């Protein structure tokens with residue numbers, strides 16, 4: 001009974017295998033703009049992706065991930081609420097069965113069509129495996145996707161999905177520049193959280209951008225043609241792979257903007 005996003009192995013059942021699911025700093029959360037607090041101490045985000053080296057794209061049964069070479073201090077994230085440098089290791093999306101839902105975080109209860117997660121790990125811990133065991137081991141940059149004009153930089157990603165439809169499938173995906181997935185502005189909200197899928201470790205400093213990126217309905221539609229299952233098996237479309245908003249508890253969401 002491996003976890004999943006189904007009615008019988010989904011988010012509501014996760015706590016049985018991973019007790020931390022009911023922890024003090026679980027993600028995602030709803031960002032209440034009536035209560036978010038502007039912190040003038042927050043520094044601007046520093047994103048250096050010019051040396052980004054993508055390797056491949058894979059369907060792991062939970063979503064599709066684009067993996068990067070994090071061997072050298074190439075693509076790193078710093079500044080903002082972070083101390084030290086964080087290396088980019090991979091990115092993936094979460095989306096819905098319809099345009100009206102799909103994002104994990106919400107803003108004043110508003111859901112977006114999808115959410116992009118760029119995962120980075122703190123270099124002071126040596127590797128990703130050790131970083132996940134620390135409260136400040138990871139930094140995930142969350143970007144909302146709204147349906148509108150097409151996003152040029154996302155087309156390369158969308159076109160290759162046809163060849164990785166089933167779980168276990170992957171393809172070489174070199175020379176992809178993640179800079180084409182970023183919005184114009186880097187204003188953001190931040191709070192201490194967790195991974196949104198099991199093991200649900202509370203090792204993440206969440207950085208959610210205020211400005212969403214626009215993608216065409218044609219682009220997001222291709223996300224919905226992927227499958228959770230492996231080739232030669234009962235077909236089960238990959239849709240609604242998002243976790244519902246969790247209790248904020250005693251946490252405060254800070255804003256880098258007024």
Ligand SMILES: N#Cc1ccc(N(Cc2ccc(OS(N)(=O)=O)cc2)n2cnnc2)cc1
Nearest residue numbers: 060062117119132140194195196197198199
């Ligand atoms: N300990 C541990 C551990 C850490 C990450 C794992 N991941 C990738 C992943 C990254 C971020 C994430 O969090 S999120 N969604 O970005 O909030 C969810 C999953 N994985 C899944 N299948 N293959 C790899 C698996 C085990």
Ligand SMILES: [Zn+2]
Nearest residue numbers: 032033034035
């Ligand atoms: Zn108000």
Ligand SMILES: [Zn+2]
Nearest residue numbers: 092094117196
């Ligand atoms: Zn994610």
